[PDB]
Amino acid sequence: LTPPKTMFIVGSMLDTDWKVWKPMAGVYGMDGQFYSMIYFDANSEFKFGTKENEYIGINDNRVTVTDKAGAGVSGSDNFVVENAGWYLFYVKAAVKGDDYQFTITFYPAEVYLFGNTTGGSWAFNDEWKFTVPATKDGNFVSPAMTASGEVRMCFKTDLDWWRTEFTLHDGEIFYRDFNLIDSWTEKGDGYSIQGSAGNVIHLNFTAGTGEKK
Numbered sequence: 001l002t003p004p005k006t007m008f009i010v011g012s013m014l015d016t017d018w019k020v021w022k023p024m025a026g027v028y029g030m031d032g033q034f035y036s037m038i039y040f041d042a043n044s045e046f047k048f049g050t051k052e053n054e055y056i057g058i059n060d061n062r063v064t065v066t067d068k069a070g071a072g073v074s075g076s077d078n079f080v081v082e083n084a085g086w087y088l089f090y091v092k093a094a095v096k097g098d099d100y101q102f103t104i105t106f107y108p109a110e111v112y113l114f115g116n117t118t119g120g121s122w123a124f125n126d127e128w129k130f131t132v133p134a135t136k137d138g139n140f141v142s143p144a145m146t147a148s149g150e151v152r153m154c155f156k157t158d159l160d161w162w163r164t165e166f167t168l169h170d171g172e173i174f175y176r177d178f179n180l181i182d183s184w185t186e187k188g189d190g191y192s193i194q195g196s197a198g199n200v201i202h203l204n205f206t207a208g209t210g211e212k213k
């Protein structure tokens with residue numbers, strides 16, 4: 001048994017009839033770890049699984065929940081999220097003997113611009129944090145860039161920043177899935193957003209799309 005290669009979340013906040021099984025992005029270089037930026041309504045109810053149609057709930061004795069976001073997570077069968085908000089839903093699925101051990105973490109919605117367009121910030125600095133929208137269909141909005149170069153964007157977790165980084169590719173959010181050393185152009189030029197002073201990024205994480213203005 002090795003760690004799972006896929007992970008999905010299903011629940012009321014994605015579709016009121018639980019028809020949407022949202023695939024999670026793999027954390028780069030960390031087998032069995034996954035992340036997804038999701039809006040949870042107040043009292044949302046959900047489960048997750050390693051494959052579509054597999055339901056794992058909060059009762060499962062393989063599951064531990066860590067709240068680092070003030071989400072408020074309880075329940076009998078379904079996970080229940082008390083406080084409405086955007087959260088980074090994070091799953092670590094390790095192997096323990098012949099079974100999985102799952103650690104579910106709720107991180108706060110902290111998205112950052114990194115790199116040359118910020119004048120060289122490669123640190124978590126709230127000057128470069130995106131503004132968070134109030135609603136499920138809203139946009140995260142970056143501060144204005146102050147210099148030219150390739151955009152880098154990421155979520156904040158406990159790991160190195162670039163384990164959970166992403167870009168835009170023809171207007172779609174694309175999560176890093178390779179050993180990116182220096183530039184997105186190592187995958188292709190259409191992955192590299194060239195920013196200039198005054199440009200702004202807008203991201204719609206429910207639709208999976210974004211733009212540079």
Ligand SMILES: OC[C@H]1O[C@H](O[C@H]2[C@H](O)[C@@H](O)[C@@H](O[C@H]3[C@H](O)[C@@H](O)[C@@H](O[C@H]4[C@H](O)[C@@H](O)[C@@H](O[C@H]5[C@H](O)[C@@H](O)[C@@H](O[C@H]6[C@H](O)[C@@H](O)[C@@H](O[C@H]7[C@H](O)[C@@H](O)[C@@H](O)O[C@@H]7CO)O[C@@H]6CO)O[C@@H]5CO)O[C@@H]4CO)O[C@@H]3CO)O[C@@H]2CO)[C@H](O)[C@@H](O)[C@@H]1O
Nearest residue numbers: 029114115121122123152161162163178179180181182183
């Ligand atoms: O003191 C103990 C310390 O010693 C060693 O470290 C040495 C380095 O060996 C040496 O080169 C030099 O480092 C300088 C560097 O030369 C300067 O350029 C500058 O570095 C800046 C850099 O210029 C900035 O752009 C920014 O880097 C970003 C980077 O742009 C970005 O793409 C990303 O990079 C990570 C990448 O995405 C990952 O995939 C991975 O890449 C790995 C590959 O996975 C692996 O397979 C292999 O190929 O190595 C790749 C490169 O490591 O990791 C990348 C990060 O390492 O993120 C970075 C970081 O934000 O910022 C850096 C500064 O952080 O300054 C440094 C000096 O600070 O001098 C240092 C000694 O000071 C030893 O290697 C190190 O472990 C020890 O701690």
